[PDB]
Short mmCIF file of C-alpha atoms (C1' of nucleotides) in Angstrom, two decimals:
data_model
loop_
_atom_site.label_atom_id
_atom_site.label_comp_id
_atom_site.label_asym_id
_atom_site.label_seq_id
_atom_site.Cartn_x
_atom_site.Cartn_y
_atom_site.Cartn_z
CA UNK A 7 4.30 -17.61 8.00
CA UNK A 8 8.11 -17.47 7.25
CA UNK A 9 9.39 -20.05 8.83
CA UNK A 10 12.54 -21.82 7.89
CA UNK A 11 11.37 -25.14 7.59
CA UNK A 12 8.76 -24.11 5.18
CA UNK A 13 10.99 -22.02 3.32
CA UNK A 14 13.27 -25.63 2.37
CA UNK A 15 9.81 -26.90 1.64
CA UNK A 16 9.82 -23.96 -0.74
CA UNK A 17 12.81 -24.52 -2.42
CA UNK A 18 12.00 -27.67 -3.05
CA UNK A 19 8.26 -26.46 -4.57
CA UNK A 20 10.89 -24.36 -7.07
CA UNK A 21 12.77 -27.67 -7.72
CA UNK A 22 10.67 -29.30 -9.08
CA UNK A 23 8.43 -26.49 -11.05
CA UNK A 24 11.19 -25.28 -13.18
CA UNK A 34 3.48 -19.16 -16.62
CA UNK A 35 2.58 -16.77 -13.57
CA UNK A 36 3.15 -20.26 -11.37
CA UNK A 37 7.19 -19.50 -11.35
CA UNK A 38 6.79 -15.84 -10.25
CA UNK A 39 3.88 -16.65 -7.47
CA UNK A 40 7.03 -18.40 -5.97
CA UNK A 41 9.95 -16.04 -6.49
CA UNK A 42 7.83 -13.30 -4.51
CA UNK A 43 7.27 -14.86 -1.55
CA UNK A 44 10.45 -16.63 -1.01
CA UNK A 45 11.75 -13.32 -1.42
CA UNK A 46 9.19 -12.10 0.77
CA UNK A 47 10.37 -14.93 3.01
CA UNK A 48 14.12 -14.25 2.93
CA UNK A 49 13.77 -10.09 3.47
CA UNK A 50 11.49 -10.86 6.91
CA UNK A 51 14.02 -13.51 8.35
CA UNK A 52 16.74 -10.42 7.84
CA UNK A 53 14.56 -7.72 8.73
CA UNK A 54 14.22 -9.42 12.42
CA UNK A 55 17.73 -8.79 12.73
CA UNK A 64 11.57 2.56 5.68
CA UNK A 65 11.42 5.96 4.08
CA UNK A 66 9.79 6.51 0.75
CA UNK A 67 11.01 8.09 -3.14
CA UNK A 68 10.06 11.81 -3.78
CA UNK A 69 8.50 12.00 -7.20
CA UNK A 70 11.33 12.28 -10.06
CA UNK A 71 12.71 16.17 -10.38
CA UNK A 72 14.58 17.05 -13.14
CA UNK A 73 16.42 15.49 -15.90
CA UNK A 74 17.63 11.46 -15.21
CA UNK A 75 21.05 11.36 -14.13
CA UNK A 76 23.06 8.15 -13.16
CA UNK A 77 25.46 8.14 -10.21
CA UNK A 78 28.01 5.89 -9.19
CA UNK A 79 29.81 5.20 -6.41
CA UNK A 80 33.09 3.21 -6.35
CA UNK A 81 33.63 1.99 -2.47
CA UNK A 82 36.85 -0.20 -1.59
CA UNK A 83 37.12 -3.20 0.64
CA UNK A 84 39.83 -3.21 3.26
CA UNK A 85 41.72 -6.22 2.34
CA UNK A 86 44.87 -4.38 2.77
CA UNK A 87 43.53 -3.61 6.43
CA UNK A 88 41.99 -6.70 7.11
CA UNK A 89 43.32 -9.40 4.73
CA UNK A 90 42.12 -12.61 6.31
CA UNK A 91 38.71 -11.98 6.13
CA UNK A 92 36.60 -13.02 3.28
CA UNK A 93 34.19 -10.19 2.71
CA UNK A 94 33.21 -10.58 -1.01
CA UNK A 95 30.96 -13.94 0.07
CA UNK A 96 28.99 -12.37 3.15
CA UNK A 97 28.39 -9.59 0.65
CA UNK A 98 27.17 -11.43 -2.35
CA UNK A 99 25.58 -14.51 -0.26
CA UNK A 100 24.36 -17.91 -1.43
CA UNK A 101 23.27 -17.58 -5.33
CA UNK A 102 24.32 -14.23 -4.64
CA UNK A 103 20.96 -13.84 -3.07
CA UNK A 104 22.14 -11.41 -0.62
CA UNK A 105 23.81 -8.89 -3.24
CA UNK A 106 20.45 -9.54 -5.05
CA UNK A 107 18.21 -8.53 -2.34
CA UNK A 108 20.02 -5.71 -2.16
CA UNK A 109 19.77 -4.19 -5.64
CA UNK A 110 16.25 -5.32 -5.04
CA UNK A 111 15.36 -2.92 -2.18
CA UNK A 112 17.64 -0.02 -3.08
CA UNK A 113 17.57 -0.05 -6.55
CA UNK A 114 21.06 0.55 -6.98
CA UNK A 115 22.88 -1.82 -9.38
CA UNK A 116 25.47 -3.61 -7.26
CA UNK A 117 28.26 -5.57 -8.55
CA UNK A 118 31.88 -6.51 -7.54
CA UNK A 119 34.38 -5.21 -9.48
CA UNK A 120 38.63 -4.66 -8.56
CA UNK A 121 41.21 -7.10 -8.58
CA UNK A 122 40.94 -10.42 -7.25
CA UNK A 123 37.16 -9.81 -8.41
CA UNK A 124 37.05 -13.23 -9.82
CA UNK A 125 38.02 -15.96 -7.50
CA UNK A 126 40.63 -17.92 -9.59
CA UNK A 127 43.51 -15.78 -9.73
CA UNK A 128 44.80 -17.17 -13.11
CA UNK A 129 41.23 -16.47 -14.86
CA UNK A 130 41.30 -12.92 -13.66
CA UNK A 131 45.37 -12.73 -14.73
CA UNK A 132 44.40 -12.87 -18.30
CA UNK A 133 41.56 -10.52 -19.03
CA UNK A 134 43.42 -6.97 -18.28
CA UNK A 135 42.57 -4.63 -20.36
CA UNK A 136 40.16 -6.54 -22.44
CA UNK A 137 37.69 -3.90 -22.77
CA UNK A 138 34.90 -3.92 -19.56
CA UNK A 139 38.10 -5.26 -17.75
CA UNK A 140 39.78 -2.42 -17.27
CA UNK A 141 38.28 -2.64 -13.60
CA UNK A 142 40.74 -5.54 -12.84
CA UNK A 143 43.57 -2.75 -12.49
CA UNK A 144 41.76 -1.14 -9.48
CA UNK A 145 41.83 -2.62 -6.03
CA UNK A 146 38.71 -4.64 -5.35
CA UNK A 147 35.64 -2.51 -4.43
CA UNK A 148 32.30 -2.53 -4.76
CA UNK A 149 30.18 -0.82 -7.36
CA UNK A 150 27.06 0.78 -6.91
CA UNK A 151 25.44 2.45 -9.89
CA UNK A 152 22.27 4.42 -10.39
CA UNK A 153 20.15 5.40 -13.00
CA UNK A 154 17.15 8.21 -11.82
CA UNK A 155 16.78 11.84 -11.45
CA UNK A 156 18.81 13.46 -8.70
CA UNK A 157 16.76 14.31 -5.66
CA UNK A 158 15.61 10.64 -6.24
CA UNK A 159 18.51 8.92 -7.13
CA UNK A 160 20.88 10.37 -4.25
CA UNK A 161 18.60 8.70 -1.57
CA UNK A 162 18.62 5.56 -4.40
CA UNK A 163 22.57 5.24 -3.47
CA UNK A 164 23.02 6.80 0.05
CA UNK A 165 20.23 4.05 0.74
CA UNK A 166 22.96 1.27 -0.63
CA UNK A 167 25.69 3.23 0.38
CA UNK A 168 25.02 2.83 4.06
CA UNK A 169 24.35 -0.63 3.78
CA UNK A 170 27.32 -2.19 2.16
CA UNK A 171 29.82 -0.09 4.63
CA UNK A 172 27.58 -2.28 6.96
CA UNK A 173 29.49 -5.11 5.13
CA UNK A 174 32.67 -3.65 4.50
CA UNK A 175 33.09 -4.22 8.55
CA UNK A 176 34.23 -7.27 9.74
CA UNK A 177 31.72 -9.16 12.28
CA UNK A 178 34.07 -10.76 14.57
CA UNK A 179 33.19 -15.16 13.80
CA UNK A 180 30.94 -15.87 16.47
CA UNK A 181 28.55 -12.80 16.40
CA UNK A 182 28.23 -12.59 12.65
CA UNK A 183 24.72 -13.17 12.93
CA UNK A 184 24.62 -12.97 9.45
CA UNK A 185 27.36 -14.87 8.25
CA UNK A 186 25.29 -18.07 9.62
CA UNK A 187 22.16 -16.42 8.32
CA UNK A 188 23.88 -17.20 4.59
CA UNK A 189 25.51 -20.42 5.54
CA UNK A 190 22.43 -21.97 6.49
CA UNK A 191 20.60 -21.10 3.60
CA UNK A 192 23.48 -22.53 1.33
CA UNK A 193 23.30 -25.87 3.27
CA UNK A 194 19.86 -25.85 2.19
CA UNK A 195 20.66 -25.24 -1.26
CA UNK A 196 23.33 -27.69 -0.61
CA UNK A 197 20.28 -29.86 0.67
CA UNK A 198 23.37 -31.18 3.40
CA UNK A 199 20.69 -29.81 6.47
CA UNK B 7 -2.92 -6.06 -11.74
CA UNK B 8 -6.92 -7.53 -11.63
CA UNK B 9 -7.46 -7.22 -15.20
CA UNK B 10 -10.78 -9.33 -16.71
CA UNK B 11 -8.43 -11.12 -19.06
CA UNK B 12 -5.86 -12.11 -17.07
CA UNK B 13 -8.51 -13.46 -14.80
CA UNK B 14 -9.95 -15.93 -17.32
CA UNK B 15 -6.36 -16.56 -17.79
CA UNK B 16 -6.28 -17.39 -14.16
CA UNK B 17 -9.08 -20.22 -13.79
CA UNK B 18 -7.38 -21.81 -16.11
CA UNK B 19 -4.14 -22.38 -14.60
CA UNK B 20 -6.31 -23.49 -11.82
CA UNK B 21 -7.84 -26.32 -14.35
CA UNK B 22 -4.68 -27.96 -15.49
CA UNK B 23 -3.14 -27.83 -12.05
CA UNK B 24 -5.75 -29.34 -9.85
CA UNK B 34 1.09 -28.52 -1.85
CA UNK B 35 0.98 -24.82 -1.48
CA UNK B 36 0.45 -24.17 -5.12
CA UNK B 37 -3.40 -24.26 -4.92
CA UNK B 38 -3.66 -21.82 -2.29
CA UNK B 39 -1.43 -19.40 -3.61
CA UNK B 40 -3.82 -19.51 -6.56
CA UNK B 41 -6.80 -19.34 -4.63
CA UNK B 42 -5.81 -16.22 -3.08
CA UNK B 43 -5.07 -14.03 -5.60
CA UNK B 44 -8.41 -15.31 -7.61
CA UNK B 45 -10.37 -14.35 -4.31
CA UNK B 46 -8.17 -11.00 -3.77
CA UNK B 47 -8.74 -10.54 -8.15
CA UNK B 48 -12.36 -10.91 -7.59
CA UNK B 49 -13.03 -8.97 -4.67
CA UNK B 50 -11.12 -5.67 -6.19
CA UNK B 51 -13.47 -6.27 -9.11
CA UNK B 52 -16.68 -6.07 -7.02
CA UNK B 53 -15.28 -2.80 -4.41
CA UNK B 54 -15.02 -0.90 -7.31
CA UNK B 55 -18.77 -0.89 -7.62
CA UNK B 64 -14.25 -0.74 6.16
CA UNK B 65 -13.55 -1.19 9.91
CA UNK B 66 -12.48 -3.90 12.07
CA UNK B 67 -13.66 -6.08 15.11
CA UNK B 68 -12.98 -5.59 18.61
CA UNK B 69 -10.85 -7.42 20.85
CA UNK B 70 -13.46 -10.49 21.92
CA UNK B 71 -15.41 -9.93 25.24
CA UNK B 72 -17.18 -12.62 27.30
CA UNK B 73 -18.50 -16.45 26.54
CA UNK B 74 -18.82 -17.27 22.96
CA UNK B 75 -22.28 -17.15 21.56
CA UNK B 76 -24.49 -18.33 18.41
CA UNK B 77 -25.91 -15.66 16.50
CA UNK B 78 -28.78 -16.06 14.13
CA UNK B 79 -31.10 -14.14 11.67
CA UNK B 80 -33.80 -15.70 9.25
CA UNK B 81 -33.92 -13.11 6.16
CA UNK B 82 -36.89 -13.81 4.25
CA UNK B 83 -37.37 -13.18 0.59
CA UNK B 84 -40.03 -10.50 -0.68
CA UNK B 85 -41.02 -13.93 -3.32
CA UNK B 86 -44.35 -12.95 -2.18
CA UNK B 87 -43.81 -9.44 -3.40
CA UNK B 88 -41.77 -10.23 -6.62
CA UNK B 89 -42.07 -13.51 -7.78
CA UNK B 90 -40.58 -12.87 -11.05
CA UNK B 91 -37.25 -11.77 -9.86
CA UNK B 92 -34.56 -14.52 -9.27
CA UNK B 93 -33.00 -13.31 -6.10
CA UNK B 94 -31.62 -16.12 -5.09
CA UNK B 95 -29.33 -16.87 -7.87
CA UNK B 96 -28.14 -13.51 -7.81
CA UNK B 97 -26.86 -14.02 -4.20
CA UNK B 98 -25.19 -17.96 -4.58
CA UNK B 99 -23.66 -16.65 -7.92
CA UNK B 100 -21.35 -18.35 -9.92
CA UNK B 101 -20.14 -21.78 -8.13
CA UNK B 102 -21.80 -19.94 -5.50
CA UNK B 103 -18.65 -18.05 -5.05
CA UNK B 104 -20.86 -14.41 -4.86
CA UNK B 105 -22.31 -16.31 -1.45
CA UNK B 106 -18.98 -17.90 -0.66
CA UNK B 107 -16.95 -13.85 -0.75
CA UNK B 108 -19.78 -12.86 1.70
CA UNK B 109 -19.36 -15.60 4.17
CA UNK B 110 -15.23 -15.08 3.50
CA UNK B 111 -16.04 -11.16 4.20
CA UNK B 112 -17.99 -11.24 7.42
CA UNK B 113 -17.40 -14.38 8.92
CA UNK B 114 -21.93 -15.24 8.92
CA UNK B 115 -22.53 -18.58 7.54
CA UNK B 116 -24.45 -17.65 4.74
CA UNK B 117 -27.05 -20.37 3.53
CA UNK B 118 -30.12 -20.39 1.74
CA UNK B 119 -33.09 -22.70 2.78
CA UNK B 120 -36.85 -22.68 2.92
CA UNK B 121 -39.37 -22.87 0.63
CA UNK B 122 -38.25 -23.55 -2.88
CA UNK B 123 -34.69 -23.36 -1.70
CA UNK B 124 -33.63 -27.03 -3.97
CA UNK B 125 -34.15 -25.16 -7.16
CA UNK B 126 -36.22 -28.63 -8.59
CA UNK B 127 -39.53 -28.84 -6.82
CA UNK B 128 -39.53 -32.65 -6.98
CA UNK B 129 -36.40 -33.15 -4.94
CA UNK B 130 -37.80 -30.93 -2.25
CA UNK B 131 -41.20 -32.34 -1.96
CA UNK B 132 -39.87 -35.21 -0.18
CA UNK B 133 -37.17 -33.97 2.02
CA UNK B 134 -40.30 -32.79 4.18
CA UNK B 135 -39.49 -33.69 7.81
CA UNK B 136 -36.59 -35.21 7.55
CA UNK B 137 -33.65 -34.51 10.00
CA UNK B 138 -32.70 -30.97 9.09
CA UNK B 139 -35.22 -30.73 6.57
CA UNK B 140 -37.79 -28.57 8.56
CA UNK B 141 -36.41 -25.59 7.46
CA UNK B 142 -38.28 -26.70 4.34
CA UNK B 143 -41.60 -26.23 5.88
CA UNK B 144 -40.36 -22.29 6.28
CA UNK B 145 -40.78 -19.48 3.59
CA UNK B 146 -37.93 -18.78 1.74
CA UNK B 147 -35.01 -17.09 3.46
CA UNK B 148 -31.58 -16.53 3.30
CA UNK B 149 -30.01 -17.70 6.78
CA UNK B 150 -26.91 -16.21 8.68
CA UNK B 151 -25.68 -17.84 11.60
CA UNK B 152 -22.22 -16.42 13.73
CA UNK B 153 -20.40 -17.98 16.81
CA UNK B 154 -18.34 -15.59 18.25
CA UNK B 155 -18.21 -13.48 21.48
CA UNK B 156 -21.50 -11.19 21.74
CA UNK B 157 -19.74 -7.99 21.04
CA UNK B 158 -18.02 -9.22 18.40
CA UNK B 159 -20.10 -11.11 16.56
CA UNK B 160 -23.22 -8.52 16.51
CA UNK B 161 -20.93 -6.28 14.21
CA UNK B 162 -20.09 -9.84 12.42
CA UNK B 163 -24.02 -10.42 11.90
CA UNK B 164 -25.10 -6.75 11.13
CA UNK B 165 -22.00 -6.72 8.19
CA UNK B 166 -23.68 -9.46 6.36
CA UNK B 167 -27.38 -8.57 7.73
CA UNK B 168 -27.39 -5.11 5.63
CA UNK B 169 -25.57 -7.03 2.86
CA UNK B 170 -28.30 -9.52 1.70
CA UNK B 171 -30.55 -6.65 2.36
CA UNK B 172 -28.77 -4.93 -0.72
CA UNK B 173 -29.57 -8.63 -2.20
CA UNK B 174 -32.70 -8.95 -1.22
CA UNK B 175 -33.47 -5.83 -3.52
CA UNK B 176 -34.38 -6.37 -7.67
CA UNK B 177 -32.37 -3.98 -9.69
CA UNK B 178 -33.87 -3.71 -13.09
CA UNK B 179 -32.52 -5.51 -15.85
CA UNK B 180 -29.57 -2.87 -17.59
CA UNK B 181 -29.15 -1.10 -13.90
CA UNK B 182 -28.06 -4.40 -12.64
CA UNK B 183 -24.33 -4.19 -12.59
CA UNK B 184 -23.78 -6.74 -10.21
CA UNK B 185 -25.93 -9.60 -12.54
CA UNK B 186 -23.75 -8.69 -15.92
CA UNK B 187 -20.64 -9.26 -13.35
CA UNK B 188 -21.29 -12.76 -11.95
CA UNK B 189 -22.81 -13.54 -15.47
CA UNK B 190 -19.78 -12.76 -16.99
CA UNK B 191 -18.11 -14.67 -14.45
CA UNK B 192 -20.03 -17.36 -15.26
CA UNK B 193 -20.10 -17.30 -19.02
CA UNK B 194 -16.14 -17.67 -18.57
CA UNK B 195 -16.13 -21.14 -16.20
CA UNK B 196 -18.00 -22.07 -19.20
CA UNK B 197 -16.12 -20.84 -21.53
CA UNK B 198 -18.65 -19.95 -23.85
CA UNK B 199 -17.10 -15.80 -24.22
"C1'" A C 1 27.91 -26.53 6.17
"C1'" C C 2 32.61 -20.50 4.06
"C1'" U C 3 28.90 -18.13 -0.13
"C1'" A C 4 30.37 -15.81 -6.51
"C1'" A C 5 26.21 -12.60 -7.98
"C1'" C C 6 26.46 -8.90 -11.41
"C1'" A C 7 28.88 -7.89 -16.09
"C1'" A C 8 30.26 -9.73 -20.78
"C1'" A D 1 -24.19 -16.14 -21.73
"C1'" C D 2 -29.67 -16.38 -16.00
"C1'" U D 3 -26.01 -18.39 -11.58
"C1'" A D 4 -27.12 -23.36 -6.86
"C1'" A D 5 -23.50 -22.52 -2.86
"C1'" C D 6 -24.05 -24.07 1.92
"C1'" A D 7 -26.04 -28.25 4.61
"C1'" A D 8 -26.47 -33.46 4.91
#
RNA sequence: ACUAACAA
RNA sequence: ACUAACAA
């Protein structure tokens, strides 16, 4: 039953709470949260060969379309959304370039400190796997094909999923 | 992951607790227990016509074994064995007749009374259904040839069943 | 209800 | 590890 009122009474449960009691909770609301999306499924071969990790390095369009926040609707309230999305592709995602980091001034400070040499590329998004081939190449072209869905600008008004987000941060904001 | 352990570690964080929190325990304990037992399935038609009451008075062979306890082996611990049947097939499962109160003092005055008569009756194991006919025959003849099964003495060390409630058991009391 | 995860 | 539910 995942209803939305239910799932602010759920929160709430978590509130409060915080040794199998924390995780009982973490799977539904998850549960929850991927079947309020998924009103909006192929399966692994078994491992062949020797484990490779692949990467994939895919830029946002801020030079195209400037205005437009796209890191947020990516990485969601909590960063939920990015972390759903690791979740049920198993590709590591994270959000590296410049202007990674919100703050400018932060960010203007930690070139080349080492793991920051990613500040010197445009902002993109990584997407890193770690699995054999034949079953890591579905692994990213699973994620692949899924953040291009987010590297696309829903005009404000049809974003379905922009308000999706938003209303789950004004429950975490506990301001609805 | 059912695991015997884990279990045991299971009733426990049902003693300390005891809105949703119960439940969610009381599933998985249920769903635990019932994977234990199946490793010792079709479903009901669409309902068709005016609902009815289904009975059937299963008698117990006392008169043929009267050393044999069947009926603990069927209530179980807490009575849970008979409380997974009636969870299972949807037959209120109940045990009356003859000898049914387990002291013979208690029952040798309920004689008569308002629902009491079924005192007066040999021993049985009752199963009652409301449900459309077609749809409750199947419920009744699930949990019909499943007493049956009870209603049968395995010898002591062939008994599988018996070590697994008693096991069960000899954890809510926390004796093993 | 304008999201900030991840990495350190 | 010898079970006691259900019904009242």
């Amino acid at each position: 039953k995942p209803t939305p009122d239910y799932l602010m009474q759920l929160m709430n449960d978590k509130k409060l709470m915080s040794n199998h009691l924390e995780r009982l909770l973490d799977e539904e609301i998850s549960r929850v949260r991927k079947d309020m999306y998924n009103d909006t499924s192929a399966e692994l071969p078994d491992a062949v060969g020797p484990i490779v990790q692949l990467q994939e390095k895919l830029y946002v369009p801020v030079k195209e379309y400037p205005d437009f926040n796209f890191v947020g609707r990516i990485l969601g309230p909590r960063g939920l959304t990015a972390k759903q999305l690791e979740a049920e592709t198993g590709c590591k995602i994270m959000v590296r370039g410049k202007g990674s980091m919100r703050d400018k001034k932060k960010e203007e400070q930690n070139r080349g400190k080492p793991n920051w040499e990613h500040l010197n590329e445009d902002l993109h998004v990584l997407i890193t796997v770690e699995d054999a081939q034949n079953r890591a190449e579905i692994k990213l072209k699973r994620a692949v094909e899924e953040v291009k869905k987010l590297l696309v600008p829903a005009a404000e008004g049809e974003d379905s999923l922009k308000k999706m987000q938003l209303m789950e941060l004004a429950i975490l904001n506990g301001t609805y």
